[PDB]
Amino acid sequence: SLYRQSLEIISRYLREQATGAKATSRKALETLRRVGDGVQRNHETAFQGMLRKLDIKNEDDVKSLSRVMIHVFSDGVTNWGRIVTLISFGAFVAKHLKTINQESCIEPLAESITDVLVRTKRDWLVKQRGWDGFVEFFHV
Amino acid sequence: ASTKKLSECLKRIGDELDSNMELQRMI
């Protein structure tokens, strides 16, 4: 249920970001576009350097990234800044892959990201009232 | 290996972004 909703949002964001195209999960995506695009624009150069270091070879070479996304939270801190920074890098990575192969898909990547968030941060996510909290946290 | 270098980078941006919202919220 919470996995399903996260995967929807994350996948859709990543999917737009790569293809350039297109209740509460609906606002979570608006928020994601607004904020995520910000961090990608703001840190395009750092993401690029990191992306080159990922040696990510194909739509399924997501294990290096998953290792990375895990060590982020490896200090005991979770916040939406980190979470949203992870998804933005996911989008930034999703866009590169199409440069490399217009065919390749974002599913493995969306699932990679969701796995780490939902399955290792479940309790934290829950404590925050879920994507409702994320939406509230970034309200304008 | 270098995984610690990349996670440290994303960690910072996330915190940077978090610090910015935490502020915009306190006011």
Side-chain angles (χ1 to χ4, degrees), chain A residues 20-70:
Chain A
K22 261 216 312 211
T24 163
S25 72
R26 182 190 244 109
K27 300 182 176 180
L29 185 32
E30 295 181 350
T31 301
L32 213 47
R33 306 205 181 102
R34 187 175 72 76
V35 183
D37 296 8
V39 8
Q40 288 190 252
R41 265 197 306 277
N42 286 319
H43 303 267
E44 184 186 47
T45 303
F47 278 5
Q48 183 66 33
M50 281 181 271
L51 155 93
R52 167 105 150 130
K53 284 219 198 76
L54 281 183
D55 173 55
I56 178 190
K57 302 192 186 68
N58 61 81
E59 62 172 322
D60 287 272
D61 188 13
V62 275
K63 176 175 289 186
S64 50
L65 185 54
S66 291
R67 210 118 42 205
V68 172
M69 299 186 293
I70 295 236

Side-chain angles (χ1 to χ4, degrees), chain A residues 45-123:
Chain A
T45 303
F47 278 5
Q48 183 66 33
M50 281 181 271
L51 155 93
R52 167 105 150 130
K53 284 219 198 76
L54 281 183
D55 173 55
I56 178 190
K57 302 192 186 68
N58 61 81
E59 62 172 322
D60 287 272
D61 188 13
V62 275
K63 176 175 289 186
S64 50
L65 185 54
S66 291
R67 210 118 42 205
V68 172
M69 299 186 293
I70 295 236
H71 274 80
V72 165
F73 292 121
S74 75
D75 60 25
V77 186
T78 321
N79 59 42
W80 287 116
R82 289 186 182 184
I83 294 187
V84 104
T85 298
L86 284 196
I87 298 168
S88 297
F89 188 70
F92 181 91
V93 174
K95 301 199 232 169
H96 186 69
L97 293 189
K98 295 301 245 221
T99 284
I100 298 333
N101 182 48
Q102 294 302 339
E103 292 185 1
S104 60
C105 233
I106 59 109
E107 276 65 51
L109 196 69
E111 298 179 56
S112 159
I113 300 182
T114 307
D115 272 346
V116 157
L117 294 194
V118 177
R119 292 164 55 175
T120 88
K121 293 305 169 173
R122 152 86 66 173
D123 310 296

Side-chain angles (χ1 to χ4, degrees), chain A residues 43 79 81-82 84-85 137, chain B residues 7 11 14-18 21:
Chain A
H43 303 267
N79 59 42
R82 289 186 182 184
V84 104
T85 298
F137 183 75
Chain B
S7 65
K11 222 172 60 60
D15 297 337
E16 190 234 276
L17 173 52
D18 199 54
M21 279 311 307

